[PDB]
């Protein structure tokens, strides 16, 4: 009861991957766990229906392990109000919002720990290292975020074409640290990671700035190993993915010790080889 938790997540392979459930059996099998998604009936009503789906991935494997050792059950659902989390007119949306407004006890996914989020939710210890990296075609001369080509884009002709997926931790960091770069980049906003990789591969974009762990995963699976992260996998603003909990959550301590036990006992290494290993 107090042991059965509402938990929110968000699709982002390979950390969280969503699949359609078997029409029959309507049962999740294999490495997957049940996760529901609220889907609107139409755009003229507030009516919707939870659709039963199945979730798997690195972070889902983490959740299963935490459920086993911290001893809780859960009702996993996919966020529909935004994505990871952004403060809009001083109100948090996304996974962060679900936790802040007490719709979820915790958020599990590719959720980046940062200062402004930590003001409104508590984060577990980081369990996946990440930060901001830059993906380019192999050989592209860029030192890092601080490269003049990004910092002062119009000092070059033609200027470097580079973008991120807006509204997440990466854009927030850039907007705060590099105001001119940021207002320049918005014209190259990408709707999502898949769009961005297509833009890079066909030469519509010179660089894609995004979450380090996801880019390292994409670099590992790239056809031809032609897209790479710069600086031999350099990372600005090193941080990690964390489990977000409500401020003052009584679950935080056990969750932290659990994650640290998984790391210390080498259980994280196998999840990494399992989900995050790539050919390139």
């Amino acid at each position: 009861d107090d042991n059965h938790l509402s938990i929110v997540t968000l699709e982002e392979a390979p950390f969280v991957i969503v699949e359609d459930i078997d029409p029959l059996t309507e049962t999740c099998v294999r490495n997957t766990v049940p996760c529901r998604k609220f889907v609107k009936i139409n755009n003229s009503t507030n009516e919707g229906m939870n659709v039963k789906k199945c979730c798997k991935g690195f972070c889902i494997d983490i959740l299963k392990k935490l459920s086993r050792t911290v001893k809780f059950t859960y009702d996993l659902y996919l966020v529909t109000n935004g994505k990871h989390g952004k403060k809009v007119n001083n109100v948090w949306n996304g996974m962060i919002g679900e936790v802040v407004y007490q719709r979820a006890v915790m958020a599990v996914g590719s959720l980046t720990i940062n200062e402004e989020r930590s003001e409104v939710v508590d984060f577990s210890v980081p369990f996946v290292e990440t930060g901001i990296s830059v993906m380019v075609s192999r050989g592209t001369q860029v030192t890092g975020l601080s490269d003049k080509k990004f910092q002062r884009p119009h000092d070059y002709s033609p200027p470097f074409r580079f973008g991120t997926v807006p509204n997440g931790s990466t854009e927030r960091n850039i907007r705060n640290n590099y105001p001119y770069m940021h207002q320049y980049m918005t014209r190259f906003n990408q709707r999502g990671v898949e769009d961005a990789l297509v833009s890079l591969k066909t030469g519509k974009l010179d660089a894609f700035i995004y979450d380090a762990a996801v880019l390292n995963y994409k670099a590992g699976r790239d056809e031809g190993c032609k897209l790479v992260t710069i600086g031999s996998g350099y990372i600005f603003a090193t941080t990690g993915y964390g489990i977000a909990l409500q401020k003052g959550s009584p679950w935080k301590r056990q969750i932290d010790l659990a994650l640290l036990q998984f790391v210390g006992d080498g259980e994280m290494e196998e999840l990494e080889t399992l989900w995050l290993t790539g050919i390139c």
Partner: protein, 285 residues
């Protein structure tokens, strides 16, 4: 109220420890970027040999962790006094009797000898049961330091996994690395070899590698990669075989713990941690 008691440990490039000048002050020096090195007076034992009395002398401390301390103190508005951990160790929990006791900085923090540990202190389950760690101020891991010429593939090399007295490897006693090897049954063969050769400090182990008295030193990559970038007769091998972070240590009921963690996150995010890396950690090759 009161000044915070900060405990730290000698561990270049995070904490350098040098004698004061005759007048009891610290010599003014400059970073590789030309800025003045911020130094603080830190008291510590001048005898560091095991089994010996630990009467302290004022000394001079500076480095990555001292710059971080100074930033924290200014940010959160506390004053402090720094001392070096008396037994010279990071801190493990050992059987006594049926008692268990924490030694090193862990022991000083838990006993009230210190109010905050500001050092390259590894976050692990064992310590986190007893103290509060901040979000990591440094992400790193473990690697292996050897003499240039020495060929081993890494942690899975047969000379480590099937050891003999022909090839000696070790770590630092009463460190997180000592714990890592004792904890994992899959590593017990390596642990039993290492417990015969472990060193009292990283500096002595590194020197022993240079002197060909130690063939491999397993330790923090942030430290070993720095040593290798400075001593061309030394190299790391195998890259990281395990990932870990350093965090600020405080008692579970410290009033400072929320804002220390927030300040750490802020510093990663605005490039301050990067500046410390450029200043202290990565400027040579």
């Amino acid at each position: 109220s009161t000044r915070l008691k900060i405990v730290t440990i000698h561990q270049e490039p995070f904490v350098y420890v040098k004698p004061t000048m005759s007048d009891g002050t610290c010599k003014e020096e400059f970073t590789v970027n030309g800025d003045p090195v911020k130094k603080v007076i830190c008291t510590g034992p001048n005898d560091t040999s095991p089994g010996s009395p630990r009467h302290t002398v004022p000394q001079c401390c500076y480095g990555f962790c001292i710059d971080l301390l100074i930033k924290l103190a200014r940010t959160m508005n506390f004053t402090y006094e720094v001392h070096l951990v008396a037994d010279g160790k990071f801190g493990t929990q050992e059987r006594v009797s049926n008692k268990k006791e924490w030694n090193g900085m862990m022991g000083e923090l838990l006993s009230g000898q210190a109010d905050m540990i500001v050092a390259p202190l590894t976050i692990n389950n064992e310590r986190a049961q007893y103290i509060e760690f901040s979000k990591p101020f440094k992400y790193q891991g473990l690697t292996i330091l050897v003499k240039k010429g020495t060929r081993i593939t890494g942690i899975n090399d047969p000379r480590l996994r099937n050891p003999s007295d022909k090839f000696i490897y070790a770590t630092v006693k009463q460190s997180s690395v000592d714990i890592y090897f004792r904890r994992q049954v899959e590593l017990s063969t390596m642990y039993r070899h290492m417990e015969k050769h472990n060193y009292e400090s990283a500096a002595e182990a590194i020197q022993a590698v240079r002197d060909n008295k130690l063939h491999a030193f397993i330790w923090d990559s942030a430290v070993l990669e720095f040593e290798a970038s400075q001593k061309c007769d030394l190299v790391t091998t195998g890259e990281l075989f395990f990932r870990s972070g350093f965090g600020i240590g405080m008692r579970k009921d410290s009033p400072w713990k929320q804002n220390v963690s927030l300040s750490i996150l802020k510093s990663h995010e605005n490039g301050f941690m990067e500046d410390l890396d450029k200043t202290w950690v990565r400027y040579q090759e």
